[PDB]
Amino acid sequence: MNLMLALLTNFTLATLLVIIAFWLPQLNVYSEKTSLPFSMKFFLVAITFLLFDLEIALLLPLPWASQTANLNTMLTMALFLIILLAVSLAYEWTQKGLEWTE
């Protein structure tokens, strides 16, 4: 109940400041003013982050995984995942995927 009440305050306060910051200026009554080409490299960096992010999701439970009695199995699987994550980086690296020159 505290967390729900904590999130409500932070965004309600942020909401109040945004609206008054939009309206408090609008009382000076100032004079009336009366006055992209797709890049495939930006997409590739966004996709690569996603696939690395999904690998990070699998690595997040490692602190709990080290409390098990099958450490020989757990350490093998943990290092396998991290290594395969390195292989992906090695693959993109060697295929000019990390470059920015057109």
């Binding site: 408090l24 990070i56 690296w93 920015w100």
Partner: protein, 315 residues
């Protein structure tokens, strides 16, 4: 008593942000052989108040926006999440004692990237949207090292609780066994927060908030400066843990605060010393220097406790 607790957290954060602008301007001035603000109030203490009043009574700038609803959503998200990342921090007792506090902070900081993205859309400027895409790409890229580096330090702590980092460091700061990670973690917080030498959004002759001027621009500024303090508070808890005496909690807060100020000052220290990276060069720093080393140190920090019999407790 809890509602009073939230205000005892929110209000000082905004006052800390307010006077960080003053401290940043004087510190840069003295490293530049200048004085910085010293006229508006004694020693410039009233300079933040003058700027605040001036900004909030200046003419609105909002031009035609295609997603006016998205124009108002971005500052709310940016400032709502910036304050939300403080509630689990142990100082020494957290406002919301979470069992998964570390994951909560990663999750909330991975949503602040929407404020950048939504502000680019709501500006009706094809050259502002390109700037936002670059800013988004940099932020998500350095979120990869923050999570892997953070995961490597928790394998010595044993849980995602932020309060257990105090126990883990009761004999020794984690920086000593994990200074290679602290070096990369610290620079990631610079790139994550878009601070020099990584502030290519301020490449005046080389931002997505241009469509915000005064008012909402002031709110984006507060959110950004609130995250610098939070990141440097997170760094202190993670690598410079303070001793906690249950009968004298205020001793922790004094020592903890001093550490978090020095790290915040060092951000200003760095901004005064270096030129900034090209966009491709700060990407090559992450993908071709930090990520290879972070992955290698994650393998090492998974196997190290096992081979030394130093696996930490789950509880």
């Amino acid at each position: 008593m809890f509602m009073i607790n939230i205000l005892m957290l929110i209000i000082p954060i905004l006052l800390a942000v307010a006077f960080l602008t003053l401290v940043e301007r004087k510190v840069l001035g003295y490293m530049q052989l200048r004085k910085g603000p010293n006229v508006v109030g004694p020693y410039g203490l009233l300079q933040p108040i003058a700027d605040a009043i001036k900004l909030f009574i200046k003419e609105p700038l909002r031009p035609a926006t295609s997603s006016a609803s998205m124009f108002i959503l971005a500052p709310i998200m940016a400032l709502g999440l910036a304050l939300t990342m403080w509630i689990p921090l142990p100082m020494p007792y957290p406002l919301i004692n979470m069992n998964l506090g570390v994951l909560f902070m990663l999750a909330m900081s991975s949503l602040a990237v929407y404020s950048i993205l939504w502000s680019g859309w709501a500006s009706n400027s094809k050259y502002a949207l390109i700037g936002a895409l670059r800013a988004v790409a940099q932020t998500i890229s350095y979120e990869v090292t923050l999570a892997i580096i953070l995961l490597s330090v928790l394998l010595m702590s044993g849980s995602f609780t932020l309060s257990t980092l105090i126990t883990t460091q009761e004999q020794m700061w984690l920086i000593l066994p994990a200074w290679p990670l602290a070096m990369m973690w610290f620079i990631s917080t610079l790139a994550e927060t878009n601070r020099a030498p990584f502030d290519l959004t301020e490449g005046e002759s080389e931002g997505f908030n241009v469509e915000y001027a005064a008012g909402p621009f002031a709110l984006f500024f507060m959110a950004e400066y609130a995250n610098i303090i939070m990141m440097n508070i997170f760094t202190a808890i993670l690598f410079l843990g303070t001793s906690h005496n249950p009968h004298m909690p205020e001793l922790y807060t004094i020592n903890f605060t001093i550490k978090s100020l020095l790290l915040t000052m060092s951000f200003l220290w760095i901004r005064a010393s270096y030129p900034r990276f090209r966009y491709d060069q700060l990407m090559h720093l992450l993908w071709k220097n930090f990520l290879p080393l972070t992955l290698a140190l994650c393998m090492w920090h998974v196997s190290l406790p096992i081979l030394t019999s130093g696996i930490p407790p789950q509880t």
